[PDB]
Symmetry: C2
Subunit: 403 residues, 2 copies
């Protein structure tokens, strides 16, 4: 058995720098997950991105998983009016993490616009099974999780209503989060109701020193970075990670789905020779070496579509274990061996639906105190039970209490 599983996740592509990243992954014999912002395809993301479409194609042809990071990384919330210069304008002020989320309905819509743009520039994109843009997402700035009904948590100081975390007098209060944070929580919930899973991260491969003129040069070297990964293995990193805005304060430490796994966050743009330093020259070798030594150390690499393991026939499942099947999360009812014809579903006796959603749904095991939406109204679950078609909340005033 492997020491553990590493999930390499790259955010904020597709950009020019993405091309050589992908080749290093391919040479290293691994697959990774890229959470993309399609505004780079429109040439308005203020990066070197004329090869953005080439990069998207290469990632997909190479078998890497493509997930959804929103169309514009929420830069519409950093400027007065969104347009071709907004990316540059927001870099001018450095106000990315201030008022990052405002109208959650509009902000969640940015993930659907991302799908439109990706499918505009690459009209064949849905013929790739590794296109997961409509299944897997990650919120900008936010170490937030919607994995299963019992595995979800928010980044409670991810974004701010005024001061940045390093500025003097900055105050983070998880118990009374910022308006931006509250908005981001609603965004998570909207996406979950559209069938997305969202995942945060355990470790962030970033500059060790942002105060030099080429901060990318300071990216952690492979050996010490592997030490960070070893340290994160089974140690609830999302609660102890720094800085404070990268935390998931109420991450469910010890949750079985998270055991023996480390999600690495990094950014394509840290591997470019450019305005952040000699990223290609200094850091592509670090990536190559990290992959080699991680494997030597006993790790294997996987992608986020398998973070929740796919249901597989012949496997013996235990009561309470989670699988993913056709994009939906299910939880085993009893110990059994999966047969071909016994796949999880909305009518299975062997599984219940355990998507991290809040709209009332068939064959879900509801707990007391859960709140579900049904036909535009909210309902408290008063009697815990497994939902069925004839027990809709509008007809069941003992099991549910209207709010």
């Amino acid at each position: 058995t492997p020491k553990g599983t590493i999930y390499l996740t790259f955010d904020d592509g597709p950009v020019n720098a993405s091309v050589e990243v992908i080749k290093v992954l391919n040479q290293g014999g691994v697959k990774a997950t890229f959470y993309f912002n399609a505004w780079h395809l429109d040439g308005i993301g203020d990066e070197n991105e004329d090869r953005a479409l080439e990069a998207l194609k290469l990632a997909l042809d190479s078998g890497h998983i493509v997930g959804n990071h929103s169309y514009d990384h929420m830069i519409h919330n950093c400027v007065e009016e969104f347009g071709p210069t907004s990316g540059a304008d927001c870099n001018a002020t450095g106000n990315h993490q201030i008022h990052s989320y405002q109208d959650p309905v509009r902000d969640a819509a940015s993930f659907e616009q991302n799908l439109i743009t990706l499918e505009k520039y690459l009209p064949t994109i849905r013929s790739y099974p590794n296109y997961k843009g409509y299944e897997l997402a990650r919120l900008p700035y936010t170490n937030g999780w919607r994995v299963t009904k019992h595995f979800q948590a928010d980044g409670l100081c991810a974004t701010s209503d005024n001061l940045k975390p390093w500025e003097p007098g900055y105050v983070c209060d998880p118990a009374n989060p910022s308006n931006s944070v509250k908005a981001s929580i609603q965004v998570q919930n909207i996406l979950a109701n559209q069938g997305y899973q969202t995942h945060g991260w355990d470790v962030d491969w970033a500059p060790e020193n942002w105060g030099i003129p080429m901060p990318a040069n300071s990216l952690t070297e492979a050996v010490p970075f592997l030490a960070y990964v070893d340290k994160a293995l089974n140690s609830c990193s999302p609660t102890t990670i720094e800085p404070i805005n990268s935390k998931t304060q109420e991450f469910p430490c010890g949750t079985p789905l998270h055991a023996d796994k480390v999600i690495v966050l990094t950014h394509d743009f840290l591997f470019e020779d450019g305005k952040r330093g000699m990223g290609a020259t200094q850091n592509l070798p670090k990536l190559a070496e990290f992959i080699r030594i991680a494997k030597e150390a006993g790790y294997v690499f996987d992608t986020m579509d398998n973070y929740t393991p796919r249901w597989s026939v012949g496997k013996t499942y235990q009561a309470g274990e989670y699988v993913l099947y056709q994009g939906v999360v299910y939880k085993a009812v009893i110990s059994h061996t999966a047969q071909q014809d016994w796949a999880p579903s909305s009518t299975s006796s062997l599984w219940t639906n355990a998507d991290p959603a809040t709209n009332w749904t068939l064959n879900v095991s509801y707990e007391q105190g859960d709140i579900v939406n049904y036909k535009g109204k909210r309902y408290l679950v008063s009697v815990p039970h497994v939902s069925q078609q004839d027990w809709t909340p509008d007809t069941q005033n003992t099991l549910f209490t209207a709010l």
Copy 2:
């Protein structure tokens, strides 16, 4: 029942939709509404200040909501799309000219529709009868993507220059307009996103568009019921007039179409306004029609049930079709359905029969089928059922890559 009628209303939500919905409720039937969300933005050039109220009433009443595109393709009717474009296009009457152009943009209008609906009614996904992401119908076009073996296009639905009633108009199904070809591509893009699309058998419309107040001439209830009887098991999409409403290659006798009539009509025909006294004259036609159709032995259903739901305990014959969790399946063998033996991507009892073209698991592929996979096109050389190990890029005895 002697048959099932599917009442379908297009081009809402508008003020006129409110009274239609109430007649349906009092008549004890559910219907399907194919909506254009631009009315919620107030730019659709109808009486539409109650648009959001109507969308809510349709949903709260249990009617099914389906996707008719954001702007009814008016962006293709004008030079630059804006708040006045519906009015501009009505001023010219060029709706059916160049109606489909860039099919990627045109299909994206269906996704934009989802965005706008979910903007004005953030709770909309909490309604099981919201089917905006599952059921669609193309503007102007009697086109169908129901199953892998039940699909056909409206070959003269739209034009590159001349309207069907104008001097010089020619329609050739064997060499369709550029607009039509683009619309065929839109159908395929939507099918690959999981949509079914459905056309219609009969269109409840003005008998005479040339008289003043043309909405008033909407067919009376009794003769309209006559039209429905005539359509029942008679392949109406091939014989219907006018020419731009035809589905020339409709698969007459296809099993899912048996004993069913889909009626198309438009909410706006039922208001008192610019098209005539539609509320006064036509709401009672709708009410009476429902009553006499039930008397004659018809029942009414919605388009989410046009492909019947998989039902536990039911016996199925090999070859029969069901809808399960939004996906069409065909039975591989006769058997009795049971709880844990539902259709799926791994079932031995069913195969996926969605009307899509991207390579998909557990599909019964036929010789000559062309599938898309990882950006390339493949011809199926021998029939087989797809499985994870048999991907087209690795199975050259099953698939042959086509040249770009």
